[PDB]
Amino acid sequence: YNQDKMICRKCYARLHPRAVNCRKKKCGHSNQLRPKKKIKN
Amino acid sequence: MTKRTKKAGIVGKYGTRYGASLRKQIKKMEVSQHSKYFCEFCGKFAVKRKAVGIWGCKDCGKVKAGGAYTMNTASAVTVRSTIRRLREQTEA
Amino acid sequence: RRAHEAKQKGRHSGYGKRRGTREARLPTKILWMRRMRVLRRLLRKYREAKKIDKHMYHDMYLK
Amino acid sequence: MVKFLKPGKAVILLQGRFAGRKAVIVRVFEEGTRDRPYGHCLVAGLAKYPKKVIRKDSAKKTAKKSRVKCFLKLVNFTHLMPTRYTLDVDLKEVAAGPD
Amino acid sequence: MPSHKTFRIKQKLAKKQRQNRPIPYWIRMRTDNTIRYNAKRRHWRRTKLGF
RNA sequence: UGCCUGAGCGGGGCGAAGCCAGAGGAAACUCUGGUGGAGGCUCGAAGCGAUACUGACGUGCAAAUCGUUCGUCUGACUUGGG
RNA sequence: GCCGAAGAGGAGAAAGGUUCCAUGUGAACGGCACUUGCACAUGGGUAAGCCGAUCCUAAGGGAAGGGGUAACCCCGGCGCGAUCACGCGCAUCCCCGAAAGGGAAUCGGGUUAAGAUUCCCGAGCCGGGUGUGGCGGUUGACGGCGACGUGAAGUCCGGAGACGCCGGCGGGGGCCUCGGGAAGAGUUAUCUUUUCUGCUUAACGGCCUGCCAACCCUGGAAACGGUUCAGCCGGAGGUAGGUCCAGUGGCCGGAAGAGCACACGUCGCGCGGUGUCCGGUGCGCCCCCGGCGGCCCAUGAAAAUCCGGAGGACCGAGUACCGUCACGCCCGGUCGUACUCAUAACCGCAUCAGGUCUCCAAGGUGAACAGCCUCUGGCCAAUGGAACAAUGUAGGCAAGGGAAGUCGGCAAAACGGAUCCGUAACUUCGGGAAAAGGAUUGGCUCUGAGGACUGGGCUCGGGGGUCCCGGCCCCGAACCC
């Protein structure tokens, strides 16, 4: 799948394409996600 | 012209680098395609290039085969005219 | 943040301290993106108050 | 709060392919019928002619075009009725006397 | 992902890993003969795993 | 070397198509401001390459390595996997 | 102090293969000590309907005639109804081939020494597979001009999935930021206080003011009008205006007085407060997404699956027929999951200055490079001690001369950003060009100039005009007695 996972800029914690938000510790709709740009070199 | 002496069309694509016999032709032969053209069906100044030899009118959407560079040309015209004349002599 | 209050409020716009490169700092296309939206927003407000004609509005919009 | 006669959602579209659109919500199965994956939901334009091929949502689809596929059938029929009437005249005249 | 998953390599790797254990204090004692330096016993840093 | 299918290229500079205004001409088309932005294009980041000290090392960190210099960097580009 | 796209942060692919956690040791290792450890020994840990495998199909590995070749080896009916049991229809087959193409469904909180979106607690949904009732309907649906919104065998046609490069507007998000300023933290040879953390909550059942594009809608009827960043669009009817469709990781609002700490205050419980705070700026076009124009002697995957158009044989009586809601249930039957992912867990004989892939391009000033930073976070590399000579390797600066040195100005120094001014020969007029050359630059303060909303001088002529309170009559009227 071309979506890969979304990895949070604060915590750096990976949480889905279906989850709206991160939550690794209270990250808690911080919405500070960017997806895996979908594969390189 | 605007800020153009000689003339250009493409010629920046070469730059200073590249060279002259070939430059006399290649403005002419990409730019003659670029020339908005009136569609044979509708008449609006729609016709633009889909691919090599492929032309399409933006408003009506009628897509046509034609020359590589140009919408048309002498050769196609001559062939159509000859065919029409032949059919008309047979009908007679 | 006091450096931002230290821009607020001019300063440092003699030539020297003022520097990234010429345009990069703001390409003037960034000022056009402001100007071009405003000049068309003014022309829409001016009609709907009614000050100009349809002939004048075309020419100036073209201008 | 009425049941119902109340707004909401199956398709018209946008010109990236074949001609269209106009198709009709009779409809949602899982949902109104627009822009998804695996499509879930349902479009028709009822029937016997804007001449739908319809094709399918939830999508980016291109229904073939409503006034044009009735004028393409009604003009096929308006062309079929004079071409039959001329054939029916040509045959009446050829059967009666000449060619 | 898993952490390359397939059971069929994964089990056999785990078998060699269970097989690489110390000899059991006892087999030194009843015993026939040997400085019982077991010996097919393999290490995370050195030499290299085989199948 | 090929094929398939993915991924990567801060930012900036220059300014080809042709059209506006302003202005000229009977037309042809022209002048000046100006816009838009084309490119195996330029200066350069990730990334690629490997020119120079003919340095350091030369029983090495290394069976070709290190530092500093230098070339390319939207393309006939680079690169993962299958 | 050092690390800053990671010379040492977070998450992972391959690969390793138990290296992880704990306890106990110390012969060997660690190029040294070692109480330590990724050494030794013994125990322990990895938990999936909703992550991935898995199913599909792509260069191709091909299975399948015939035939060369002894030979190895190599080229090139089935299906479905159908219940009573039985008959009917067709064209190119069938598996592997991506754990990073395509894809049915999950989040938030908690807890473990060691797992965790995996178990729990709460809540949700899916898929697959039998019953139930609410009823929405019944000679196969009303409404809205319209667009369009709220049965069923034989038989054909088909989207999404599903797609190139360049430029690049628009929505809006998490950011970055500021202030009102809670709550609570720093700290004052000498002050103003400012400064700092901090104000945070799903997935998703329900509402939307619902953008753009298409509306050959309707309606109007422009020969110059509308309009863009730009191209453009139009009388195969423009602009108004009465309509539509229609996005989102997106407004609302509910999920949610469900929720653990954030911090302080408490033996423990508790209780309060934060969690129901306000408002906005900066093209940061970033990642997600919807459009446009341009471009190719070069044209940008396929199938699974999801899903409907038709075009219909048959069947529609107090009998009997379907399909969303609701709902009830069962199943959910496979594998993997630890840890490293690297100047110590990979490859290179080594705890090797080498090599080895993806995402985090939104951390703060300054975006010219480079530096410094910080509440993430991480680290002080397997040698120290005491002097400091020459020799050497890294390296700075040397008067006055200025290449005399050397194959060679080699190196190094030197110039340097940026604005204004100005700019030669030659030229395929593209360029040459940042030619050259020369001048400006601080600290600081104000002005000028660049945003959205509302309003903007004296006289004449054109188009349009509202609320509040008190008292009273006759009637209707949700509700209560």
Automatic annotation (TrEMBL), chain B:
This is 60S ribosomal protein L37a, expressed. SUPFAM superfamilies: Zn-binding ribosomal proteins. The gene is LOC123183015. InterPro entries: Ribosomal_eL37/eL43, Ribosomal_eL43, Ribosomal_zn-bd. Pfam families: Ribosomal_L37ae. Zn(2+) binds at residues 39, 42, 57, 60. Keywords: Metal-binding, Ribonucleoprotein, Ribosomal protein, Zinc, Zinc-finger. One of its GO terms (biological process) is translation.
Automatic annotation (TrEMBL), chain C:
It comes from the Eukaryota. Residues 9-20 have a biased composition (Basic residues). Residues 1-21 are annotated as: Disordered. Belongs to the eukaryotic ribosomal protein eL19 family. This is Ribosomal protein L19. It comes from Triticum aestivum (Wheat).
UniProtKB/TrEMBL annotation, chain E:
Pfam families: Ribosomal_L39. Keywords: Ribonucleoprotein, Ribosomal protein. Gene3D superfamilies: Ribosomal protein L39e. The keyword Ribonucleoprotein applies. One of its GO terms (molecular function) is structural constituent of ribosome. One of its GO terms (cellular component) is cytosolic large ribosomal subunit. One of its GO terms (biological process) is translation. Belongs to the eukaryotic ribosomal protein eL39 family. This is Ribosomal protein L39. It comes from Triticum aestivum (Wheat). The gene is LOC123150917.
